[PDB]
């Protein structure tokens, strides 16, 4: 791989701030050599500076944790990816042919209930921030709509899929997702900055506060830091740090979290767009310099996360901007991948 470009990374962060991110930061673990940069504030009212050690809400990076647990259950013989979801969760879905593999790769056709919840950004956030939902509550919300397409038809993102994933994990193991993440991933990898505290609203330790950008251009930002994230749970409630996500994705890609066979299934790509694929709770992004990286993006109110690693896990990158509902910042932060993996032009 070419050398990571710190000057380019510095510019990306600086640009994100110019676009509305109170703070932005990135950490690269380049085969044992660390690159770390940050600019801006963790708390815009107090002015405390953001740092690469600040904890944050990783959004759907959570999906990769959920998929890891499920694939270990496959290795253990407790789950068959091609078995129907209704086999393990009787009567849950109206189609007894929607499979676990389809749900894990967003090819189930299940309607995404969050499209209803967040039609309006801030009102939607105020509506769910302090709510506690059961997994079934969420599935029911989804099922009120018809499916959007035939199972296995094509990739269509839906948080409902990983809500089902969490329900499967708890049913098959008889434990909470928190317990499973801890025993199967957090402890083994010693991810000391990683937690799943749902429905607690507090983020443990020093963290970056999240700032939700309202739908109205120029509108005042909303501190969205403390919420239950119950609308996502196994689809997006994990809290972590740049160091911990780098360790996790490097461990995943270097083959330390499941059998070679299950990692292969995890990387069977379904087309998302011309430069992206989705496997099982895992995203593939193709960079301009012809390099593909693996991991996941995350969006939780006030937090945009990119956490990706090279195919062999030797280089990993995690970037975070503490604002959300700001496409300019979202697009800009994606450039950290180009600077970190592709290097200087
Ligand atoms: C992107 C990532 N998905 C996630 O991380 C999941 C957990 N988050 C969402 O589906 C976004 C919820 C709305 C956020 C809100 N948007 C609105 O409110 C829009 N009205 C915001 O930007 O904070 C993935 O699929 O890889």
From Swiss-Prot:
The chain holds residues 34 to 378 of 406 of the full protein. It comes from Streptomyces sp. (strain R61). Its EC number is 3.4.16.4. It is an enzyme of class 3 (hydrolase). GO terms for biological process: cell wall organization; peptidoglycan biosynthetic process; proteolysis; regulation of cell shape. Belongs to the peptidase S12 family. It catalyses: Preferential cleavage: (Ac)2-L-Lys-D-Ala-|-D-Ala. Also transpeptidation of peptidyl-alanyl moieties that are N-acyl substituents of D-alanine. One of its GO terms (molecular function) is serine-type D-Ala-D-Ala carboxypeptidase activity. Substrate binds at residues 118-121, 157-159, 283, 297-299, 324-325. GO terms for cellular component: extracellular region. The keyword Hydrolase applies. Keywords: Carboxypeptidase, Cell shape, Cell wall biogenesis/degradation, Hydrolase, Peptidoglycan synthesis, Protease, Secreted, Signal. This is D-alanyl-D-alanine carboxypeptidase. Catalyzes distinct carboxypeptidation and transpeptidation reactions during the last stages of wall peptidoglycan synthesis. Mistaking a beta-lactam antibiotic molecule for a normal substrate (i.e. a D-alanyl-D-alanine-terminated peptide), it becomes immobilized in the form of a long-lived, serine-ester-linked acyl enzyme and thus behave as penicillin-binding protein (PBP). The active site is at residue 60. Pathway: Cell wall biogenesis; peptidoglycan biosynthesis. It is found in: Secreted. The lineage of its organism: Bacteria, Bacillati, Actinomycetota, Actinomycetes, Kitasatosporales. Transmembrane segments: none annotated.
């Amino acid at each position: 791989l070419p050398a990571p470009d710190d000057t380019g990374l510095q510019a990306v962060l600086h640009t994100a701030l110019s676009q509305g991110a109170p703070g932005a930061m990135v950490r690269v673990d380049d085969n044992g050599t660390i690159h770390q940069l940050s600019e801006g504030v963790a708390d815009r009212a107090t002015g405390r500076a953001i740092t690469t050690t600040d904890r944050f809400r990783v959004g759907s990076v959570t999906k990769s944790f959920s998929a890891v647990v499920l694939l270990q259950l496959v290795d253990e013989g407790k789950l068959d990816l091609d078995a129907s979801v209704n086999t393990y969760l009787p009567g849950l879905l109206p189609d007894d042919r929607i499979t676990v593999r389809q749900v894990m790769s967003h090819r189930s056709g299940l309607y995404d209930y969050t499209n209803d919840m967040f039609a309006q950004t801030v009102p939607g956030f105020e509506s769910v921030r302090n709510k506690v939902f059961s997994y079934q509550d969420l599935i029911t919300l989804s099922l009120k709509h018809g499916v959007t397409n035939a199972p296995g038809a094509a990739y269509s993102y839906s948080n409902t899929n990983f809500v089902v994933a969490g329900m499967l994990i708890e049913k098959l193991t008889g434990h909470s997702v928190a317990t499973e993440y801890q025993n199967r991933i957090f402890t083994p990898l010693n991810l000391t900055d990683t937690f799943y505290v749902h429905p607690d609203t507090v983020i443990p330790g020093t963290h970056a506060n999240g700032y939700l950008t309202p739908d109205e251009a120029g509108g005042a930002l909303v501190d969205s830091t403390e919420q239950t994230v119950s609308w996502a749970q196994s689809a997006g409630a994990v809290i972590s740090s740049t160091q911990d996500l780098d360790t996790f994705f490097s461990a995943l890609m270097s083959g330390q979290l499941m059998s070679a066979a299950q990692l292969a299934q995890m990387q069977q790509w379904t087309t998302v767009n011309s430069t992206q694929g989705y496997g099982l709770g895992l995203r593939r992004r193709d960079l301009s310099c012809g390099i593909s990286v693996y991991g996941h993006t995350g969006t939780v109110q006030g937090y945009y996360t990119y956490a990706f690693a090279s195919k062999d896990g030797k280089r990993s990158v995690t970037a975070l901007a503490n604002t959300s509902n700001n496409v300019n910042v979202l697009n800009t932060m994606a450039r950290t991948l180009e600077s970190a993996f592709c290097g200087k032009p």
